[PDB]
Design a protein around this ligand. Structure first.
Ligand SMILES: NC(=O)c1ccc[n+]([C@@H]2O[C@H](COP(=O)([O-])OP(=O)(O)OC[C@H]3O[C@@H](n4cnc5c(N)ncnc54)[C@H](OP(=O)(O)O)[C@@H]3O)[C@@H](O)[C@H]2O)c1
Ligand SMILES: Cc1ncc(CO)c(CO)c1O
Ligand SMILES: [Mg+2]
Length: 286
């Protein structure tokens, strides 16, 4: 707890252990979850445990994830931040398609508002999808961001963020609109964004890693598992605790369909990583 367990996202304080809602839909993040009852329970328990940052999207399931959040939690407390993301849509074959035309982005914001039961969205991330590969890639985002900026000026969107972006795209974006967070691939074994994380921190912009555990080689995984065992913890817990201490602007949004996993994830706050452990951990990427 050298770093605070809270950070200011836009204009609201959030607990840096938050909840990502992507698991509350069927396989491929498509259709209903296996059990809507359990989904509702997880969301309510998350709030009970102090979660006040939920990450979602209307193209999760399409629509159904937001509607579950609404059934479970509406009316929302003033302390809750719901972050959503636009820029993609789902094919009938559960595919993930670009959706960056002004009509599509407007529809997306419109859908989020209806399905969450809101009049204004706290934070909308623009999910950028340049190139044929999956990660960040260069290319102007001015056109989409201009559209989002209009909806902000119209009062539909309070704050704008970015997802899946290069450091250059962030710089470009910040000329058009204020950016309150960047949501990118990042974990203990994938640390390309390290310099940007620090730069963003200095400017007071949040960084939201996704995939806390994953794309790990057997040796990477074995090392994390060794550390976890030495601490009486779970690998997920170590990965989360490591992200917490990495930088004070980092917000965590682990997703789960399981109440037990949720409790375990929130318990990662209790984990103190010694400088010895950190040396082992800071060396996993290399
Ligand atoms: N911006 C983007 O393009 C984008 C992309 C990916 C994700 N996201 C967001 O980021 C959030 C995080 O997603 P992620 O890709 O980073 O991965 P993640 O949600 O952290 O991992 C999901 C997997 O981890 C399992 N899990 C969670 N806690 C566990 C635990 N304590 N023990 C064992 N397994 C556990 C879940 O299974 P169980 O359900 O069985 O627990 C699920 O299979 C998502 O919820 C979503 O909101 C955004
Ligand atoms: C496969 C896949 N593709 C695209 C996205 C977002 O554009 C996500 C998550 O928001 C994803 O999981
Ligand atoms: Mg998830």
């Amino acid at each position: 707890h050298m770093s605070s367990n809270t950070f200011t996202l836009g204009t609201k304080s959030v607990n840096r252990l938050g909840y990502g809602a992507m698991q509350l839909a069927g396989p491929g993040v498509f259709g209903p979850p296996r059990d809507r009852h359990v989904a509702i329970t997880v969301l309510r328990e998350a709030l009970a445990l102090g979660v006040n940052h939920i990450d979602t999207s209307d193209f999760y399931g399409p629509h159904v994830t937001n509607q579950i959040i609404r059934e479970a939690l509406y009316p929302y407390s003033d302390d809750l931040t719901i972050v959503t993301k636009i820029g993609a849509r789902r094919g009938e074959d559960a595919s993930w398609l670009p959706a960056f035309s002004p009509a599509e982005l407007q529809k997306a914001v419109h859908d989020n508002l209806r399905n969450l039961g809101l009049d204004v969205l706290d934070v909308v991330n623009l999910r950028v999808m340049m190139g044929d590969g999956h990660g960040p890639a260069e290319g102007s985002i001015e056109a989409s961001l201009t559209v989002l900026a209009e909806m902000q000026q119209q009062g539909l969107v309070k704050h704008i963020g970015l997802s899946n972006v290069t450091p250059t795209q962030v710089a470009e974006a910040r000329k058009i609109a204020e950016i309150v967070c960047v949501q990118n691939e990042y974990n203990i074994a994938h640390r390309a964004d390290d310099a940007m994380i620090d730069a963003l921190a200095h400017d007071g912009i949040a960084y939201v890693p996704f995939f806390p555990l994953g794309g790990f080689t057997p040796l990477q995984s074995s090392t994390l598992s060794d550390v976890a065992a030495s601490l009486g913890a779970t690998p997920m817990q170590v990965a989360l605790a490591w992200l917490l201490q990495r930088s004070p602007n980092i917000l965590l949004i682990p997703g789960t369909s399981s109440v037990a996993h949720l409790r375990e994830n929130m318990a990662a706050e209790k984990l103190h990583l010694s400088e010895e452990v950190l040396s082992t951990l800071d060396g996993i990427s290399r």
